[PDB]
Amino acid sequence: STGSATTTPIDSLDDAYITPVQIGTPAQTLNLDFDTGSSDLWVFSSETTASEVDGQTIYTPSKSTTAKLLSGATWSISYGDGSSSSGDVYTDTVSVGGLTVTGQAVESAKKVSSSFTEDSTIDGLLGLAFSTLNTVSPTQQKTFFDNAKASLDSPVFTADLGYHAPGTYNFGFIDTTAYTGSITYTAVSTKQGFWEWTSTGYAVGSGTFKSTSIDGIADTGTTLLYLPATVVSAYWAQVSGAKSSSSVGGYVFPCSATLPSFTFGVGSARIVIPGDYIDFGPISTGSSSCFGGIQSSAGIGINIFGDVALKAAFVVFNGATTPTLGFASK
Numbered sequence: 411s412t413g414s415a416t417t418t419p420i421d422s423l424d425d426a427y428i429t430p431v432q433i434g435t436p437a438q439t440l441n442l443d444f445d446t447g448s449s450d451l452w453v454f455s456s457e458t459t460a461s462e463v464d465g466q467t468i469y470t471p472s473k474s475t476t477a478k479l480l481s482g483a484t485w486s487i488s489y490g491d492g493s494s495s496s497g498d499v500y501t502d503t504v505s506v507g508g509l510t511v512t513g514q515a516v517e518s519a520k521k522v523s524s525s526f527t528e529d530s531t532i533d534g535l536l537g538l539a540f541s542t543l544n545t546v547s548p549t550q551q552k553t554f555f556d557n558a559k560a561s562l563d564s565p566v567f568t569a570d571l572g573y574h575a576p577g578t579y580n581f582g583f584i585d586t587t588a589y590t591g592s593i594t595y596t597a598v599s600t601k602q603g604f605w606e607w608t609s610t611g612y613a614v615g616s617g618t619f620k621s622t623s624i625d626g627i628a629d630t631g632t633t634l635l636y637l638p639a640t641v642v643s644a645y646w647a648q649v650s651g652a653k654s655s656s657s658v659g660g661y662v663f664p665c666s667a668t669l670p671s672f673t674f675g676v677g678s679a680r681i682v683i684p685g686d687y688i689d690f691g692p693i694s695t696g697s698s699s700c701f702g703g704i705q706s707s708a709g710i711g712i713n714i715f716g717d718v719a720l721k722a723a724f725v726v727f728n729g730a731t732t733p734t735l736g737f738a739s740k
Contacts, residue, residue, distance in 0.1 A: 423690055425633050435503055436474075443532050475498075480546075484498055497519040573684075606628070609675050633690075667698040689702075
């Protein structure tokens with residue numbers, strides 16, 4: 411089998427992407443944030459505290475003929491941004507882009523933190539990291555990908571995120587029309603439960619490429635590119651008036667600037683992030699200070715190749731016995 415779904419930015423900044431997901435019988439379509447940095451499929455629901463729902467579409471298990479309470483199971487998750495959610499669990503039929511899994515754990519939120527409530531566009535998350543990170547207790551549950559894998563034509567999914575445009579998540583096949591050149595594959599460590607890999611280095615603008623190992627994760631659920639402070643300082647030093655602002659929470663730059671590109675290595679291959687991908691616009695409405703899309707990973711404890719980096723590539727998440735990542739230009 412295969413599946414193919416369009417993923418759409420939630421706003422004009424590409425802060426996140428939503429992908430429609432069918433849950434239950436008859437189908438309930440929710441728009442979920444596909445997150446290769448976590449492993450829980452959780453949804454706003456009929457169980458979510460009413461004051462914590464503000465415009466989201468909810469899953470109502472009582473209206474699904476295929477829903478079954480997973481008796482005794484609970485979940486609770488905290489993300490890198492300090493957001494959180496928790497609840498109980500149902501199993502149900504879940505379809506993405508025509509690919510159906512039966513008996514998928516659908517984690518029903520009873521509570522969500524304020525950032526989820528305030529984002530009316532995101533009806534929940536669909537985790538695509540390794541199932542070792544799934545938070546369901548006392549019986550850990552599998553991701554949608556892990557449950558689909560054995561049925562797929564090839565044990566892969568691909569992320570093709572757009573810059574200020576829709577993109578595609580495919581499951582079970584590699585669309586050879588979706589990228590240019592060849593795909594460069596690189597090793598993955600699953601030790602932390604992430605799609606963790608090592609970039610071979612970077613360049614700033616038209617500058618020379620610096621060969622250096624940068625371990626980090628491929629995380630579709632993180633908006634920005636978080637790299638070591640040395641790399642990030644080297645980038646922003648090429649932008650007149652850029653500075654790290656403790657008050658704002660990262661590097662800011664004059665909105666009048668033209669940003670340089672940023673290149674990262676994948677083996678001997680190179681992925682170029684255009685300068686405009688690194689512009690996240692005014693820090694507050696009407697400000698002439700703009701927020702940078704490349705930020706320090708200092709304090710976070712891991713480097714994160716988030717959407718800023720991944721949307722410059724066609725990315726293969728290869729879930730074979732020995733997982734690998736692939737990157738191609740596009």
